[PDB]
């Protein structure tokens, strides 16, 4: 008679999941786990319901200096991350330079609210022309103007007295102070805006000893202006003051920002826009909401985010070869 | 992390 039979073997199911090994690839398996995510919404979102600071076509310089076109940001709320275009076009309206701009942006990567306070009022300029510092390269509404947070002081009558102003951080939070120097094309322009021909700017703090002198040269009409405007910045510790003393080519700090919230943030070089959303992970290419430990979207991420690998397929085999 | 193989049959470890 045919005998009873015990047999030994394994399980097979309808899984078309394939996994790769060192010797064999595309091995069909009973159970597998994809460990890599490849899905993004394609739009900037809140992070912990905290809105991003979408600078749009404006730059960090124009936003902090007060470019007439960046007036949309005159008052910004708390942000999780700034979004700045690669080549923002609302930048220095008056051609010039920002001393250690990239460093200032690296410090901005660690802030999460700035409060703008008028350090020196624009009406505090009795000996000098305050509202005469407007230019055609900085248009606010098809008429002329300048950076809002800074004042382009100009001689009164035909006399530009020595400015000797001082501000003490009575505030317990550190302050961000920003000033500037106009570098004109000829000595006639010099004496026209600032009577005194030889001019100097003296900025002094506990860690600052600054003796600037305008550089007059035949430069070119960038933005229609051959003159330049070099901008400088520094951080004021509490119980600490900044002293300005200048006789010409002085761009006076009107507004200054305090570091009220020093959290964690980034500068996202992305051309996307706010999409009325909130996610736990944000990339320059979109937002990710994946429990998978890995991702392949963008190496620069913000928030609770997966790890980034430059791979296209990552699946772990959890079962055995399928029939 | 629990992949849940053969559900209602085995106690997949890890939570």
């Amino acid at each position: 008679d045919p005998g009873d039979q015990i047999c030994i073997g394994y399980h097979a199911n309808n899984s078309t999941e394939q996994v790769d090994t060192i010797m064999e690839k595309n091995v069909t398996v009973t159970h597998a786990q994809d460990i890599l995510e490849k899905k993004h919404n394609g739009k900037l979102c809140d992070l912990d319901g905290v809105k991003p600071l979408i600078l749009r076509d404006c730059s960090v310089a124009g936003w902090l200096l007060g470019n007439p076109m960046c007036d949309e940001f005159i008052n910004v709320p708390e942000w999780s991350y700034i979004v700045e275009k690669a080549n923002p076009v609302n930048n220095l309206c008056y051609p010039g330079d920002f001393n250690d701009y990239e460093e200032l942006k690296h410090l901005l990567s660690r802030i999460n609210h700035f409060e703008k306070i008028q350090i020196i009022p624009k009406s505090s300029w009795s000996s000098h022309e305050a509202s005469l510092g407007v230019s055609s390269a900085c248009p606010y509404q098809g008429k002329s103007s300048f950076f809002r947070n800074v004042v382009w002081l100009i001689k009164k009558n035909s006399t530009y007295p020595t400015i000797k102003r001082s501000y003490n951080n009575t505030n317990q939070e550190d302050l961000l102070v920003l000033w500037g120097i106009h570098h004109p094309n000829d000595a006639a322009e010099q004496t026209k805006l600032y009577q005194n021909p030889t001019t100097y700017i003296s900025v002094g703090t506990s860690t600052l000893n600054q003796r600037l002198v305008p550089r007059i040269a035949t430069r070119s009409k960038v933005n229609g202006q051959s003159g330049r405007m070099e901008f400088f910045w520094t951080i004021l510790k509490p119980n600490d003051a900044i002293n300005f003393e200048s006789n010409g080519n002085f761009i006076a700090p009107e507004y200054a920002y305090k570091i009220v919230k020093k959290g964690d943030s980034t500068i996202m070089k992305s051309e996307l826009e706010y999409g009325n959303c909130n996610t736990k992970c944000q990339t320059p290419m979109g937002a990710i909401n994946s429990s998978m430990p890995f991702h392949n979207i963008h190496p620069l991420t913000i928030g609770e985010c997966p790890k980034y690998v430059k791979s296209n397929r990552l699946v772990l085999a959890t079962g055995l070869r399928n029939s | 992390w629990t992949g849940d193989f053969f559900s209602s049959h085995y106690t997949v470890p890890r939570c």
Partner: protein, 176 residues
């Protein structure tokens, strides 16, 4: 694979087996069916989940890039930043891919080992009382009823009871 069990002397899988990865198929006078060895399947479930989570936790400490800017006279340090943040990414992507490949090959052969172990286990309990067909099955010289079947499965095969019976039944096979 390394143990010759899956895709080897057991050339196929059981779609009818549903409650486990490894198990047995019986075919006695009373019926034929599939049962699953719950012990080996669980042990494998536990080991596999632990392997995945360990891999994930080891990967969790992985370099994370930060964005920085360098002017047109900081080209050398910009190149340094670029090459380093990408070299860490290269090293880490390799690490992940290679680990996946290796640990998968080892998971597959772990399943192979489990199947071969269970096969050898019952080959050792079923002694001269059973003929080894080679396809992954054993033919009982003495007829093994459902309870007798589970005895083989659960590991409580009281050989001596069927020892005399299957010895007498082997006598006839020995004399034709």
């Amino acid at each position: 694979g390394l143990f010759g069990a899956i895709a080897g002397f057991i050339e196929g899988g059981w779609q009818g087996m549903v409650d486990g990865w490894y198990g047995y198929h019986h075919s006695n006078e009373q019926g034929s069916g599939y049962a699953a060895d719950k012990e080996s399947t669980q042990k494998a479930i536990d080991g596999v989940t632990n392997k995945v989570n360990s891999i994930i936790d080891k990967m969790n400490t992985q370099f994370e890039a930060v964005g920085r800017e360098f002017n047109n006279l900081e080209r050398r340090i910009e190149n340094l930043n670029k090459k380093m943040e990408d070299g860490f990414l290269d090293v880490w992507t390799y690490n992940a891919e290679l680990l996946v490949l290796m640990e998968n090959e080892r998971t597959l052969d772990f399943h192979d080992s489990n199947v071969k172990n269970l096969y050898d286990k019952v080959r050792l309990q079923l002694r001269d009382n059973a003929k080894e067909l080679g396809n992954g099955c054993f033919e009982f010289y003495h007829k093994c009823d459902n309870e007798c079947m589970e005895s083989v499965r659960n590991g409580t095969y009281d050989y001596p009871q069927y020892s005399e019976e299957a010895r007498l039944k082997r006598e006839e096979i020995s004399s034709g």
